[PDB]
Scaffold this active site. Structure first.
Site, PDB file in Angstrom:
ATOM      1  N   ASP A 123      47.548 -50.767   3.694  1.00 39.25           N
ATOM      2  CA  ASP A 123      47.469 -50.007   2.672  1.00 39.25           C
ATOM      3  C   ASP A 123      48.822 -50.197   2.000  1.00 39.25           C
ATOM      4  O   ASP A 123      49.678 -49.134   2.262  1.00 39.25           O
ATOM      5  CB  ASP A 123      46.869 -48.631   2.561  1.00 39.25           C
ATOM      6  CG  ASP A 123      46.642 -48.114   1.060  1.00 39.25           C
ATOM      7  OD1 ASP A 123      46.752 -48.621   0.314  1.00 39.25           O
ATOM      8  OD2 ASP A 123      45.947 -46.870   1.370  1.00 39.25           O
ATOM      9  N   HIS A 126      37.545 -50.589  -3.053  1.00 38.96           N
ATOM     10  CA  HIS A 126      36.743 -49.548  -3.764  1.00 38.96           C
ATOM     11  C   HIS A 126      35.643 -50.258  -4.239  1.00 38.96           C
ATOM     12  O   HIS A 126      36.060 -51.154  -5.101  1.00 38.96           O
ATOM     13  CB  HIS A 126      37.894 -48.666  -4.781  1.00 38.96           C
ATOM     14  CG  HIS A 126      38.928 -48.337  -4.053  1.00 38.96           C
ATOM     15  ND1 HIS A 126      40.326 -48.870  -3.705  1.00 38.96           N
ATOM     16  CD2 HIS A 126      39.238 -46.970  -3.780  1.00 38.96           C
ATOM     17  CE1 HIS A 126      41.099 -48.200  -3.192  1.00 38.96           C
ATOM     18  NE2 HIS A 126      40.575 -46.834  -3.065  1.00 38.96           N
ATOM     19  N   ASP A 166      45.680 -47.231   8.474  1.00 36.80           N
ATOM     20  CA  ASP A 166      46.217 -47.618   7.337  1.00 36.80           C
ATOM     21  C   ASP A 166      47.888 -47.845   7.567  1.00 36.80           C
ATOM     22  O   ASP A 166      48.726 -46.823   7.800  1.00 36.80           O
ATOM     23  CB  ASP A 166      46.163 -46.545   6.143  1.00 36.80           C
ATOM     24  CG  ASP A 166      44.997 -46.693   5.165  1.00 36.80           C
ATOM     25  OD1 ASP A 166      44.055 -47.706   5.712  1.00 36.80           O
ATOM     26  OD2 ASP A 166      45.072 -46.251   4.227  1.00 36.80           O
ATOM     27  N   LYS A 168      46.137 -36.862   2.887  1.00 40.33           N
ATOM     28  CA  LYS A 168      47.397 -37.005   2.164  1.00 40.33           C
ATOM     29  C   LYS A 168      48.038 -35.710   1.748  1.00 40.33           C
ATOM     30  O   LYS A 168      47.003 -35.150   1.266  1.00 40.33           O
ATOM     31  CB  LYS A 168      47.308 -38.049   0.956  1.00 40.33           C
ATOM     32  CG  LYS A 168      48.617 -38.518   0.165  1.00 40.33           C
ATOM     33  CD  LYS A 168      48.354 -39.452  -0.999  1.00 40.33           C
ATOM     34  CE  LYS A 168      49.710 -39.967  -1.548  1.00 40.33           C
ATOM     35  NZ  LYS A 168      49.718 -40.460  -2.949  1.00 40.33           N
ATOM     36  N   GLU A 203      47.470 -42.712   7.462  1.00 37.88           N
ATOM     37  CA  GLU A 203      48.271 -43.637   6.824  1.00 37.88           C
ATOM     38  C   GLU A 203      49.706 -43.353   7.207  1.00 37.88           C
ATOM     39  O   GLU A 203      50.176 -41.853   7.033  1.00 37.88           O
ATOM     40  CB  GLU A 203      48.057 -43.644   5.289  1.00 37.88           C
ATOM     41  CG  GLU A 203      49.120 -44.658   4.746  1.00 37.88           C
ATOM     42  CD  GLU A 203      48.886 -44.651   3.328  1.00 37.88           C
ATOM     43  OE1 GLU A 203      47.717 -45.025   2.640  1.00 37.88           O
ATOM     44  OE2 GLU A 203      49.831 -44.718   2.295  1.00 37.88           O
ATOM     45  N   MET A 263      35.615 -52.354   5.898  1.00 36.82           N
ATOM     46  CA  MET A 263      35.619 -51.118   5.487  1.00 36.82           C
ATOM     47  C   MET A 263      35.583 -50.829   3.878  1.00 36.82           C
ATOM     48  O   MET A 263      35.990 -52.159   3.412  1.00 36.82           O
ATOM     49  CB  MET A 263      36.917 -50.496   5.793  1.00 36.82           C
ATOM     50  CG  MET A 263      37.292 -48.850   5.436  1.00 36.82           C
ATOM     51  SD  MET A 263      37.975 -48.908   3.641  1.00 36.82           S
ATOM     52  CE  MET A 263      39.713 -49.066   4.143  1.00 36.82           C
ATOM     53  N   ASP A 320      54.273 -46.741  -0.134  1.00 41.71           N
ATOM     54  CA  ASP A 320      53.463 -47.663   0.250  1.00 41.71           C
ATOM     55  C   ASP A 320      54.447 -49.234   0.417  1.00 41.71           C
ATOM     56  O   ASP A 320      53.721 -50.205  -0.029  1.00 41.71           O
ATOM     57  CB  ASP A 320      52.380 -48.167  -0.678  1.00 41.71           C
ATOM     58  CG  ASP A 320      51.237 -47.114  -0.784  1.00 41.71           C
ATOM     59  OD1 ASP A 320      51.334 -46.033   0.072  1.00 41.71           O
ATOM     60  OD2 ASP A 320      50.520 -46.835  -1.574  1.00 41.71           O
ATOM     61  N   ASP A 338      37.244 -51.806  -7.642  1.00 39.52           N
ATOM     62  CA  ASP A 338      38.131 -53.027  -7.597  1.00 39.52           C
ATOM     63  C   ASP A 338      37.201 -54.070  -7.622  1.00 39.52           C
ATOM     64  O   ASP A 338      37.569 -55.339  -8.138  1.00 39.52           O
ATOM     65  CB  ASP A 338      38.743 -53.199  -6.256  1.00 39.52           C
ATOM     66  CG  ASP A 338      39.664 -51.747  -5.784  1.00 39.52           C
ATOM     67  OD1 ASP A 338      40.497 -51.277  -6.893  1.00 39.52           O
ATOM     68  OD2 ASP A 338      39.737 -51.577  -4.479  1.00 39.52           O
ATOM     69  N   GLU A 392      40.732 -40.023   4.904  1.00 37.30           N
ATOM     70  CA  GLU A 392      42.344 -40.287   4.811  1.00 37.30           C
ATOM     71  C   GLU A 392      43.073 -39.218   4.372  1.00 37.30           C
ATOM     72  O   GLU A 392      42.904 -39.006   2.909  1.00 37.30           O
ATOM     73  CB  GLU A 392      42.305 -41.571   4.107  1.00 37.30           C
ATOM     74  CG  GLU A 392      43.833 -42.206   3.946  1.00 37.30           C
ATOM     75  CD  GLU A 392      43.893 -43.479   3.008  1.00 37.30           C
ATOM     76  OE1 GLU A 392      42.764 -44.051   2.652  1.00 37.30           O
ATOM     77  OE2 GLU A 392      44.799 -43.727   2.538  1.00 37.30           O
ATOM     78  N   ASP A 437      54.862 -41.553  -2.708  1.00 40.50           N
ATOM     79  CA  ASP A 437      54.120 -42.300  -1.663  1.00 40.50           C
ATOM     80  C   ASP A 437      54.760 -43.926  -2.082  1.00 40.50           C
ATOM     81  O   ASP A 437      54.211 -44.178  -3.111  1.00 40.50           O
ATOM     82  CB  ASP A 437      52.667 -42.282  -2.175  1.00 40.50           C
ATOM     83  CG  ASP A 437      51.747 -42.773  -0.767  1.00 40.50           C
ATOM     84  OD1 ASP A 437      51.952 -43.265   0.165  1.00 40.50           O
ATOM     85  OD2 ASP A 437      50.782 -43.541  -1.490  1.00 40.50           O
ATOM     86  N   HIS A 478      51.986 -41.405   4.637  1.00 36.89           N
ATOM     87  CA  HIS A 478      51.402 -39.817   4.283  1.00 36.89           C
ATOM     88  C   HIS A 478      51.751 -38.856   5.059  1.00 36.89           C
ATOM     89  O   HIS A 478      52.167 -37.776   4.594  1.00 36.89           O
ATOM     90  CB  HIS A 478      49.893 -39.895   4.158  1.00 36.89           C
ATOM     91  CG  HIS A 478      49.431 -41.000   2.893  1.00 36.89           C
ATOM     92  ND1 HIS A 478      47.905 -41.113   2.771  1.00 36.89           N
ATOM     93  CD2 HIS A 478      49.964 -41.561   2.057  1.00 36.89           C
ATOM     94  CE1 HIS A 478      47.781 -41.861   1.636  1.00 36.89           C
ATOM     95  NE2 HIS A 478      49.215 -42.545   1.317  1.00 36.89           N
TER      96      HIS A 478
HETATM   97 MG   LIG Z   1      45.505 -45.375   2.357  1.00 38.63          MG
HETATM   98 MG   LIG Z   2      50.055 -44.197   0.254  1.00 36.78          MG
END
Ligand SMILES: [Mg+2]
Ligand SMILES: [Mg+2]
Ligand SMILES: [Mg+2]
Ligand SMILES: [Mg+2]
Ligand SMILES: [Mg+2]
Ligand SMILES: [Mg+2]
Ligand SMILES: [Mg+2]
Ligand SMILES: [Mg+2]
Lengths: 386, 386, 386, 386
Positions: free
Chosen positions: D286, D53, D244, D182, D216, D87, D256, D56, D180, D254, D219
């Site tokens: 991710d 991002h 992802d 979710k 993802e 990406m 992850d 980031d 993406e 979520d 998700h």
């Molecule tokens: Mg993701």
């Molecule tokens: Mg996630």
């Protein structure tokens, strides 16, 4: 028009209206509230009292001098407003030291620290007049299977609660404990994940009479369970010491919406049950004003909690008082459910040919239960259509 | 190569391999199996025994003469094969008379009939050598809130189980009861919906030592709960009398897939727990061969149940025996979780300044738990990569 | 008092009030209804019309002579009552031949049979005046990963719908198709499991203008999704050809409760959306009277479907007409959401320093959205508290 | 032994190994990582590249001078290591200004700011060589029904993506967009909640060829959906631009988890599909190393992501290459699923009496699908039992 007064026993956590709006993906959207201003503003809305974690009232790391000053200010605001403190609890989840739990951390020195932190706040809770001490084991659990031997962890959990019970009895304190279950979040799975698991665990403690449950609407719904049913089982066991009211839209992260939001018909049946059963404890709201809101939205959301309880209380009372509903309950044989199956005893049941040999199964099977007409009467009452 | 023998104690319900494939949207895809042929064919696959509902073995409505003939044929097949019958249960869900329940039907005469139907099969179960009698209250519950006062229903459920306990003790029978929980389906919500609620309920019965649980993999997963965790709590309480093994893909209708399907890593941690704890009861499969299959697919699916248990047993044993895993368990402080928090007692804990006043919270918080390395060792063992 | 008339366009499937109550664990509790009596009794309740699967109206395996007689009787009851038939569909799920699907069965000869069975009923639907032909691919899917190559299956699904589109256009029929999504049950996972997947699939068909969706309240809620949001996306795409109304309590088996049961606030927001957007198609109820009910309970449940729609319609209209709500909508900037972000175009946006270089992010962030006050006004209107 | 190299195209977000462990209930447990050290340490583990991002890499509020220095340091670490940046994405969720969304915020000035913030990072992404630009609309949605008119919001979402497409084409950039999805968290419901809704939305954009999906694992599983099925539909549409990879244990917050954790058999079928279909994009993780871990646990968790992909790739390849599996696929008629239903055309199908009039439905229905034997072969291969 649905105005609360302190006699309705509505209470709020400091951490509820004080939530700054920091979620896993975003920074805070509201400034921190002084606990003194929260007490004043809740009293103006008609609340009965407030609850607290130790770390909500006294910042973590405070010296005993700073600690005394934080308590004195708080007590002055309680005296100024007439607000009570019926429940208190310990924060055993925010500080990084609790990342694998408090009472069931794998590290023994962390478990001992968790107990000492709890005992210090029990003393303060008693000083402020709390009657219930809640434990939410939010970090007790695991993300992976080998990280936690659950039998050893339950041994450690029983050891911790037994020690707390020994402490309160040796001090002569008039306080009881309530376990607040949650199935997951922040741990992948949390120990004692539902009302049922908590009730079962309590029966293995050395002094079970000191422990009950503090169920939360949204937490049982995170497992897809029927919250009024779980409360009925808690009442049946004599263990509903406290309750957390809020809203949740199904199986997802813990939303902590204001009470009445989420599953509205479950909220109706919950209020019906609590009022019918004569529950006399606090009506506590463990909720979070959404982070979209400013401070005017915070107090609107808090007021909505109490408003929705009082509307639902009126609708449930009208439902139960309606002669047409009383007739429908008899049509559905709710009266027969309350009568013993076999008060005549086992031998009489075995000798009763009308119970088996001569029972007309087809005629009994043909009887409709009339549940749908009853449920539409309940819908009509909820919506004010009757 | 992962071949079962009767010593592995694998058992199957008659209703499992005998499921004809009729689901809510479709007709049967397979002909009915004779119970005698199921016994023979399960024995050839290496099973240890079979289980039954009364109505699986004796068609509903049979005369006492037809009843005796059905039992005699069945007993001859058991004698011919060496197969055992370790568990039996009652069908209190198929017949329309049970549409609002058996033990907790609103109609009192139905509740009395349900008890007499149960008692008749307990006698038969004892005659066939069963040690466990299972109760699955699949119709006990509700689709709407006013249909069922849950406190009255729990009174009726306690009354029924207390009467069954009085019956077995007065007859001198050596049999115990196991409650099989399920959260929903076919009722919108089912009473005693999880292992936890069932364990809690048992503690309110007059003779709690006679009652335990029969948890099913898929049912706890229909509430999104961790099945190995729930089994650990059942073992901790001394109440795991029996277990139902199968597979389930998350929160949806009860799939009853063959064991090992669904959540594979949960199956691994379950087998690890059962074998570590020394569970010595039957490994019972309550599963349904999918209705896509013909009879060759039925027996392949049943064989797969036992095969997957034996593969997972080998992988879990290799995991626990690996010196590198034993080192990793100590690195994650599983040894410390098993040690008492405060065997020195409450007063010593209160006087121990290293537990609070002088505890270095930041240094403890900095210690990693090393759970991810441990969990990847578990993954490597499961996949045969080590 | 909330009395429906045919002008409200309420419709019911023959299979809804005609459901005999056979679920995966129990036998039927009600006798079969003659389609003629269902039509008469629905007309007396104020319904507008009925819908049917081919096999609801004409028993599977009927000769062309028996077929003609079943249709003639049905048409006479429509003429006698004024009832319409706005939608029809095919049963491609009950017969064992469809155990691995119809359009996407692995067996090619089954796929060809499924198409011919569908085409025969399209002719009948057109003859009876249906404007929409629904496809629910309840058997299209899998319980295991290797059983179904999903890319090949989507090729076969596109092939089938393209052929149906070629058929209706070559015949000159004025009928359109609607796909009804469902995420699971009876298959472990069903292809095109949500409104979104169905909308995406339609855009790859040769004549996309002939195809839309028939979403069902309970099915989107079986995936935990927001049904009004999904309907809004369907309306936005111009694809809401039909809708199935009912109730569902969260993520579990497909309950098909009467409309208004289950998630009551979702039902309110759905009715608000349909009425605001001017949806003019049938208000179709795909529901099952619970098997606890006798025939009086069947008609009470059906009447409740229409009653709850009309109550919610009144409450949503009062909400939108309330000047205080209109003020609150402006306070929450719903008016600004409807205004283009950048009608001035890309270059003007890039040159607009007030959009970035000189944008006061902190002042914008401080603005509360006032969503909680708006939502409590919506609650007050739903409950008749204002 | 399952060692990754850059040719395997494994990539990681800066925010993944850099997650400090701050969850809704706890403070960070790890210090922040310098992006330069993350790049070096990922390169040593065998990664191919990193993603970011804007916020980031460049702290929010940086001056253009500080911005240039942050990019220069980053580019030097890429040159030093050979790491790529395939990406990039925009943070439109952390800052309080985005509390009601970015592209679909009710406030128009916030929507314009969101577009300018995005466009600035697209320029940087192109400069660093990114081929895909991801959009995750984590704040686009609502907690309550009246807060968001979803049709207006979809208009605003289409407007934003159309403007981004106009920008990249006017600049001549060779970059494509991936949405993406979710379903929820942090908003109560998120717009475009699944792969299907995103694919459908893309077809209404002005230049649909520029947009695909970035699904993802976790998700889609938060909606209880089958992730390999959704990926198959994305591949079928030609829209799988990026993916992802991670793990998730069912319907909850979520998680992850590292890839391979959570639903292991879904991970196997996913890898089988990606490798069979020849997906050639990045294998992006991710994921979040659990907050129980120190930095050694972070790198162990990241290494585990790649290890589990490579183990599953080997097992899926062995499965597909096994002559016994190829025989079983033909026994289950997977070959017939790939053959057209009616390449002979509509008229020939209508004239084909073997497709209906003379089709033997009972003989076709009797054919078993042999899916359970096939699925146990897949299990044996996954577990290394064959
Ligand atoms: Mg993701
Ligand atoms: Mg996630
Ligand atoms: Mg909560
Ligand atoms: Mg709480
Ligand atoms: Mg089951
Ligand atoms: Mg079972
Ligand atoms: Mg349905
Ligand atoms: Mg439907």
């Amino acid at each position: 028009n649905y105005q609360p007064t302190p006699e309705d026993r509505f209470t709020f956590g400091l951490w509820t209206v004080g939530w700054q709006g920091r979620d896993p993906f975003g920074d805070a959207t509201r400034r921190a509230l002084d606990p003194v201003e929260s007490v004043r503003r809740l009293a103006e809305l008609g609340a009965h009292g407030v609850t607290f974690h130790d770390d909500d009232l006294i910042p973590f790391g405070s010296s005993d001098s700073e600690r005394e000053e934080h308590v004195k200010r708080f007590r002055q605001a309680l005296d100024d407003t007439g607000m009570k403190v019926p429940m208190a609890t310990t924060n055993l989840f925010t500080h990084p030291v609790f990342k694998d739990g408090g009472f069931t951390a794998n590290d023994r020195d962390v478990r001992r620290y968790a107990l000492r932190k709890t005992i210090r706040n029990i003393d303060l809770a008693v000083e402020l007049g709390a009657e219930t001490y809640v434990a939410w084991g939010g970090r007790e659990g695991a993300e992976s299977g080998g990280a936690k031997d659950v039998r050893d962890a339950l041994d450690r959990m029983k050891e911790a609660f037994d020690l707390l019970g020994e402490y309160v009895t040796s001090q002569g304190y008039d306080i009881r404990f309530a376990i607040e279950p949650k199935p997951n979040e922040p741990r992948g799975d949390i120990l004692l994940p539902t009302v049922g698991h908590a009730l079962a665990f309590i029966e293995r403690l050395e002094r079970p009479e000191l422990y009950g449950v503090n169920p939360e609407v949204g937490h049982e719904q995170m497992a897809g369970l029927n919250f009024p049913h779980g409360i009925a089982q808690a009442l049946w066991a004599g263990k509903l010491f406290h309750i957390d009211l809020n809203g949740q839209n199904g199986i997802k992260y813990d939303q902590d919406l204001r009470f009445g939001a989420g599953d509205l018909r479950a909220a109706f049946w919950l209020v019906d049950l609590l009022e019918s059963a004569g529950y006399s404890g606090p009506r506590h709201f463990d909720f979070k004003p959404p982070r979209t809101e400013d401070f005017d939205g915070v107090w609107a959301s808090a007021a909505g909690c109490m408003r929705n309880y009082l509307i639902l209380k009126e609708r449930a009372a009208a439902f139960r008082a309606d002669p047409e509903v009383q007739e429908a309950l008899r049509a559905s044989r709710l009266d027969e459910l309350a009568r013993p199956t076999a008060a005549d005893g086992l031998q009489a049941l075995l000798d009763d040919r009308s119970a088996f040999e001569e029972f007309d199964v087809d005629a009994a099977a043909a009887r409709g239960m009339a549940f749908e007409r009853l449920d539409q009467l309940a819908m009509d009452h909820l919506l004010g259509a009757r």
